[PDB]
Amino acid sequence: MFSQILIIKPGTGISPNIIISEDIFPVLHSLFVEHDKKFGITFPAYSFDKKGHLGNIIEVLSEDKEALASLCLEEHLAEVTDYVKVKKEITFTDDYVLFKRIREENQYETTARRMRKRGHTELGRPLEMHIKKKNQQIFCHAYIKVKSASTGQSYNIFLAPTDIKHGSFSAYGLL
Amino acid sequence: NIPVGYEVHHIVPLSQGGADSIKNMIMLSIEHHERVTEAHASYFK
Amino acid sequence: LKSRPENLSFARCLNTTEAKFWQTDFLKRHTFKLPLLITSQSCTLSTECDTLRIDFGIKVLPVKESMYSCSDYNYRTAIYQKIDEYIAEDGFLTLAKRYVNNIANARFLWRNRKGAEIIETIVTIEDKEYPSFNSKSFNLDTFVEDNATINEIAQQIADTFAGKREYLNIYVTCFVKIGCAMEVYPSQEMTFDDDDKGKKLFKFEGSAGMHSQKINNALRTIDTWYPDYTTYEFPIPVENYGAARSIGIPFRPDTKSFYKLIDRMILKNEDLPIEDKHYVMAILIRGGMFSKKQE
């Protein structure tokens, strides 16, 4: 579990979330889908509250030190030197908190046709306020704005830390 | 913070002279709140 | 001299004009310029040109007579004496260099700075075109005092600050290349409306522009002598309590809030380190209504 660290430079003029969702996330997603994807994403500043604030520090994890060396995080990122800082120090970490995606209900009219094409009951208005239940919690965690690379759209990825120390990672990096 | 699936409901309705004091409400389930509200609306109105 | 007077108000010494945007091409930026209209409105750059141009100006006045209102003559004499001591000590060169460095590194571009491939700013003083700036090669935290043109502008602005001339006019223009048919980020306005809560951008003279307050806030981001600076290593905008909304920690909450420094400087007449003098003179440059109750 060798870990490479990136620090978001504060007091610049752009919120750290925009820098995360603009340049770092597509680059790491492309590097993950190019490579085995075994690298994991860690946020060693997470602080859940009434609102799930993200933090300021990015960590990437790998089983192999040479895998992180070949990932070449020092390479590229030559235009974000004034916003994020990379360091050439990689070491095995004692703690590695993984993050899991909490993808959920989409919308009313979005799910309307795909629920009527199988669930022919046409329930309509009642109990669909249950969706207003679930989002009420899910709109309290940290998320990332990401554009759909393939299907020409954009959506939000909601994530939360989990206690499972090992597993299979997604294309983005979540467990 | 407020627990998920639980809402604040006053035992004495505010529309019928309820009080905004600590001793006036108890948290209830997401369904039982609706049942109490519908029963009170049916009784009064 | 036992307390601050009932009325005390200082006018600002660095006035900034509102900005406006234009569209052009990098190879023909010296020839033509096209307006950048506003299209939940959201502005965007046209599909032919690929360069955005921002023009604005600064008016500078001397600091000594910049005091607007005061209630006691002894306080005015004490303030004038301390300002004279600061002038005789250094000569306003450090703050001048920091301001011209904030101009040079183009901190006023804000969100439009990120993602650009080339930036070039031109500053003209008294119909004299100074050499151009490559604003990309400028770290946001460095405060280098070695550029020749930076020193040339710094001497003039410091001389205008202290007592040498009654006014100075600075005109700044900048070309930033972001690509073709991209999106720019103008300023916004208040939303007291109960309906249509979408963003309403700033429409200055029909085109798209940026507020003068935003440019001034970007320019006066030179405070580094705050406590715990070695634990953070980034300049903050100059403010009374030193509050920074980017993080959420007031770097000068009680012991280094401007009121107690000015009280110790004037009423107690105690000597201060040069960092505190820099902070107090920067605050006086910004201006305010540092007034007091009847006690």
Describe the model.
This is part of a larger assembly, with chains A (175 residues), B (45 residues) and C (295 residues). Chain A has helices spanning 16-34, 65-71, 108-116, 130-138; strands spanning 2-8, 40-42, 57-62, 84-86, 91-92, 98-101, 142-147, 154-162. Chain A is α+β, with helices and mostly antiparallel strands and 175 residues long. In chain A, a hairpin with a 6-residue loop joins β7 (142-147) and β8. The radius of gyration of chain B is 11 Å and the shape is flat. In chain B, strands 1-2 form a two-stranded antiparallel sheet. Chain B starts with 5 loop residues before the first strand and ends with a helix. In chain C, strands 2, 3, 4, 5, 7, 8 and 9 form a seven-stranded antiparallel β-sheet that branches. Chain C has a two-stranded antiparallel ribbon with strand order 1-6. Chain C has a two-stranded antiparallel sheet with strand order 10-11. Chain C is built from six helices and 13 strands. Chain C is of the alpha+beta class. Chain C has helices spanning 73-89, 93-104, 148-162, 212-219, 258-266, 274-286, and strands spanning 8-10, 14-16, 20-24, 34-35, 51-60, 67-70, 118-124, 133-134, 168-177, 203-204, 207-208, 243-244, 249-250. The radius of gyration of chain C is 21 Å and the shape is globular. In chain C, α2 crosses α3. Chains in contact: A-B, A-C. Chains A and B meet through α4 of A and loops of B. The PDB classes it as rna binding protein/dna/rna. Keywords: protein, RNA, RNA binding protein/DNA/RNA, RNA BINDING PROTEIN-DNA-RNA complex. Type I-FHNH Cascade-dsDNA R-loop complex. Chain A: Cas6f. Organism of A: Selenomonas sp.
Distance between the termini of chain A: 15 Å
Report the total helices of chain C.
6
Total beta strands of chain C: 13
Pattern of helices and strands of chain C = EEEEEEHHEEHEEEHEEHH
Helix content of chain A: 25-40%
Report the count of strand segments of chain A. Answer: 8
Distance between the termini of chain C: 12 Å
H/I helix tally of chain A: 4
Biggest sheet descriptor of chain A: 5 strands, antiparallel
Biggest interface pair, counts = A-C, 12 and 17 residues
